[PDB]
């Protein structure tokens, strides 16, 4: 491995989203994972009816005082569905006490204008802590919104929503919004040195396919310590996942529920080396 990287969300036995996905994506790009699950969900929570859920609240605590004790370091982390405040905050101050290269943080909150199932403006202010630290975040517009404390908008001013996102973030770091549309393209916003609004994205594709979102995370973190700038890492991250959700399509499944297909976008990497989240 070339180096370690912590990746802490949900893990879903059956679904192929979350750290089912990014175990495999982290590993092909050479990093040693720890793989921390959050929550361990019997499957996803889309479409299975209701899942078998172990409650992880009082373990991630003894994981992080084992980890301290053992002297572990990481270089880098990736943090994706956390589920509750006192796990947020358990996650925030373990961060704090490495010394990482890189935290990306998806700041899973909620979509289509709405917060998800079980999630309140507590949990809110409880992401706005764990962010504050990040070097890059990948809210999607909703997140933004709510991130902000801004109405929900389906298409924000992102000459006003980036600036305010981004000052909520230590000095250096990143807001990145990851589901702007932009005619028949959908992809990433964010900002320049110069404070210019930047986007990349691709053509966007019919339909709608679990597991995109954590995908898309794994990948830019992934290409984010390897040493790529942000600009051309959005532009790949892009490219595969688009890449990633075609070879969906391509498969014409019968079960909609498993997440997005990883064969050709583990394939490009190993080239490159040579309502409820979903």
């Not at 999630?119 to 409880?126: G, K, N, P, R, S």
Request: with cysteine.
């Amino acid at each position: 491995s070339l180096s370690t990287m912590l990746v802490a969300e949900d893990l879903s036995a059956v679904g192929g989203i979350s750290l089912s996905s990014a175990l495999p994506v982290l590993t092909a790009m050479q990093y040693d994972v720890a793989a921390l699950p959050t929550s361990l969900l019997s499957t996803h929570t889309s479409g299975y009816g209701t899942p078998a859920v172990v409650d992880l609240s009082t373990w991630l605590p003894q994981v992080f005082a084992h980890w301290t004790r053992a002297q572990l370091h990481f270089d880098q982390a990736l943090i994706g569905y956390v589920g509750s405040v006192a796990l947020c905050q358990q996650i925030t101050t373990y961060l704090e006490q490495q010394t990482l290269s890189l935290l990306v943080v998806d700041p899973v909150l909620g979509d289509l204008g709405q917060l998800y199932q079980g999630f309140d403006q507590d949990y809110v202010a409880a992401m706005r802590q764990l962010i504050q630290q990040a070097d890059v975040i990948l809210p999607n517009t909703t997140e933004a919104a709510l991130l902000t404390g801004a109405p929900y908008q389906v298409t924000p001013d992102l000459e006003v929503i980036l600036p305010a996102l981004q000052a909520q973030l230590k000095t250096g770091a990143h807001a990145v919004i990851t589901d702007v549309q932009r005619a028949d393209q959908i992809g990433c916003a964010w900002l320049d040195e110069a404070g210019h609004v930047q986007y990349c994205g691709a053509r966007r594709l019919p339909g709608h396919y679990n597991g995109t979102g954590d995908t898309l995370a794994a990948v830019i973190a992934g290409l984010l310590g390897r040493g790529y700038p942000l600009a051309p890492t959005l532009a790949r991250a892009n490219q595969w996942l688009n890449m990633a959700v075609a070879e969906t399509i391509a498969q014409n499944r019968t079960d909609d529920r498993q997440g997005v297909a990883l064969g050709d976008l583990l394939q490009a990497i190993l080239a490159l080396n040579e309502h409820h989240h979903h």
